[PDB]
C-alpha cells in the first residue's frame, strides 16, 4: 500500500558501471536460453512422452518451476540496468522476489525427491515398484509447491518498495533495522542447502556403493555412471556454494560483526555474480537430467 522512507547505512555499495551492463546482459542470455530450453523440455516430457514414470513427473514440475522464475527475470534485468531503480511498483516487487525464492526452494526440494526415487528404483526396484505410483508423485509435487511457497512467505511479507532519502532512489528490497532478518538467510542456508544437499549426497552415495559392490563380484557397463554421479552432486554443490557463502557473509553485515562499507561493497558487487551462476546452472537442470535418458535425448534432438 504505502511507500516507506529509508536511510541507507552503506548506500554506494555494488554501484559500479560494469555491473550495470554485465548483469542485465547475462540475465538476457539466461532468459532466452531458459525459456526455449525448458519449454521444449515440457513439450517432450508431457505431450511427446505422456508422463509414464515418477521421474517424468518430477522432471515436468522442475521445468514448470523454472519457467515461472524466467518470466520474472526481465524485471530484475531492467531493474539492474537502471542503476537499481524499481519502476514496477510494490505488487510486482512482491511477486518477483517471491518467485526467485520460490524457484530456489522448489528446485532443490524436487532434486531431493528425485534422489530418493532413483535410490529406491535401483536398490529396491521390486518392493518400491508398488509404493511408487503416479498419485504419490503428484501428491508429493503439490506438497513441494505448497512448502516452497511456505518458505518464500517472508519474501512476500517483507519485500517493499522504499524511497532512499539520502540518494533519491526508489528501490525494491528488504530493509534491515537487529530486527531478526537473519531467519531469511539461515532458511536459505540450512533449510535451502544443508538439509537437501545432505539428503541428495546420501541417496547418490547409497547408489554408488550398491553398484560398486555389484561390480566387485564380477571383477573378483556401469563404469561410466560413477563420473556421471560425481557430476550430479558436485554440479549441484558448486553452483550454489558461491551464493550461499556470500549469503552467509551478508548475515554478518545484517546485524552483527561486519560494520564496514568496503566489505559491503565487495559483497554487493559479488552477490549478482553468484546469483547469475546459481540460476544459469539451475535453469539447465531439467535439460541436464533429461539428456541422461536415451529416449528423451532422441526426442529432444529430433525436435531441433
Amino acid at each position, epitope marked *: 500500500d504505502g511507500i516507506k522512507r529509508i536511510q541507507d547505512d552503506c548506500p554506494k555499495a555494488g554501484r559500479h558501471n560494469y555491473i550495470f551492463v554485465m548483469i542485465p546482459t547475462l540475465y538476457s542470455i539466461i532468459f532466452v536460453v531458459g525459456i526455449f530450453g525448458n519449454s521444449l523440455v515440457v513439450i517432450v516430457i508431457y505431450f511427446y512422452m505422456k508422463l*509414464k*514414470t515418477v521421474a*517424468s513427473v518430477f522432471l515436468l514440475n522442475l521445468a514448470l518451476a523454472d519457467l515461472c522464475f524466467l518470466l520474472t527475470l526481465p524485471l530484475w534485468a531492467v531493474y539492474t540496468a537502471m542503476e537499481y531503480r524499481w519502476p514496477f511498483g510494490n505488487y510486482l516487487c512482491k511477486i518477483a522476489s517471491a518467485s526467485v525464492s520460490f524457484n530456489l526452494y522448489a528446485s532443490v526440494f524436487l532434486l531431493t525427491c528425485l534422489s530418493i526415487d532413483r535410490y529406491l528404483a535401483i536398490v529396491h526396484p*521390486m518392493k518400491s515398484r*508398488l509404493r511408487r505410483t503416479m498419485l504419490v508423485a503428484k501428491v508429493t509435487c503439490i506438497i513441494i509447491w505448497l512448502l516452497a511457497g511456505l518458505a518464500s512467505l517472508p519474501a512476500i511479507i517483507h519485500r517493499n518498495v522504499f524511497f532512499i532519502e539520502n540518494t533519491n532512489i526508489t528501490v525494491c528490497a528488504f530493509h534491515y533495522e537487529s530486527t531478526l532478518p537473519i531467519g531469511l538467510g539461515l532458511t536459505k542456508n540450512i533449510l535451502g542447502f544443508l538439509f537437501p544437499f545432505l539428503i541428495i549426497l546420501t541417496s547418490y552415495t547409497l547408489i554408488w556403493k550398491a553398484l560398486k559392490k555389484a561390480y566387485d563380484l564380477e571383477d573378483n557397463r556401469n563404469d561410466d555412471i560413477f563420473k556421471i554421479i560425481m557430476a550430479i552432486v558436485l554440479f549441484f554443490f558448486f553452483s550454489w556454494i558461491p551464493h550461499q557463502i556470500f549469503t552467509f557473509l551478508d548475515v554478518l553485515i545484517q546485524l552483527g560483526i561486519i560494520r564496514d562499507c568496503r566489505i559491503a561493497d565487495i559483497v554487493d558487487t559479488a552477490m549478482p555474480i553468484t546469483i547469475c551462476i546459481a540460476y544459469f546452472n539451475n535453469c539447465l537442470n531439467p535439460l541436464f537430467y533429461g539428456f541422461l*535418458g536415451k529416449k528423451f535425448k532422441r526426442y529432444f534432438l529430433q525436435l531441433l
Partner: nanobody
Framework: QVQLQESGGGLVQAGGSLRLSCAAS????????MGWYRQAPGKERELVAS???????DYADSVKGRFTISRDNAKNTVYLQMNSLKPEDTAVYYC????????????????????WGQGTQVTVS
C-alpha cells in the same frame, strides 16, 4: 521395447499344481531381476516372488513354502512352480523384469527400466 511372454495359467483344483513360464524377448543383453506380481480381484497388486541373476530370491510371506521361483540366464526365462494352489492364489499373475541398456545411464523417463507383461489368469477351484 522389451516383451515378456507368459504362459501356464488357467483353472486348477484346490491343492493342485501349476507352472508359470515367462520368457523375456528382444534385448541384446541380460535382464537384471525378474519376478511375478499377482493382481487379486478387487484388491491391490502384490509381489509374489522375485529372483536375481546372481541367485538371490525373495518370496512373499503368504506363499512361503508353497511356491518356488527359478530362472535361466541362458535365454532369460523365469519359472514359478506353484504347488498346493489354495483359493488365496486366485488372481491375474503378471511378469516383471528390470532390463538396462548397453552403456546404461540409470535414468529412464519412459519405462523406468521396469517392464511388465500381459498377465495370465490363474483361478483355483
Amino acid at each position: 521395447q522389451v516383451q515378456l511372454q507368459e504362459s501356464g495359467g488357467g483353472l486348477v483344483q484346490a491343492g493342485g499344481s501349476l507352472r508359470l513360464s515367462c520368457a523375456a524377448s528382444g534385448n541384446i543383453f541380460d535382464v537384471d531381476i525378474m519376478g511375478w506380481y499377482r493382481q487379486a480381484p478387487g484388491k491391490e497388486r502384490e509381489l509374489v516372488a522375485s529372483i536375481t541373476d546372481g541367485g538371490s530370491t525373495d518370496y512373499a510371506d503368504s506363499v512361503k513354502g508353497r511356491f518356488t521361483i527359478s530362472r535361466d540366464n541362458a535365454k532369460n526365462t523365469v519359472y514359478l512352480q506353484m504347488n498346493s494352489l489354495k483359493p488365496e492364489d486366485t488372481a491375474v499373475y503378471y511378469c516383471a523384469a528390470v532390463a538396462y541398456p548397453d552403456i546404461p545411464t540409470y535414468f529412464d523417463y519412459d519405462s523406468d527400466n521396469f517392464y511388465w507383461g500381459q498377465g495370465t489368469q490363474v483361478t483355483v477351484s
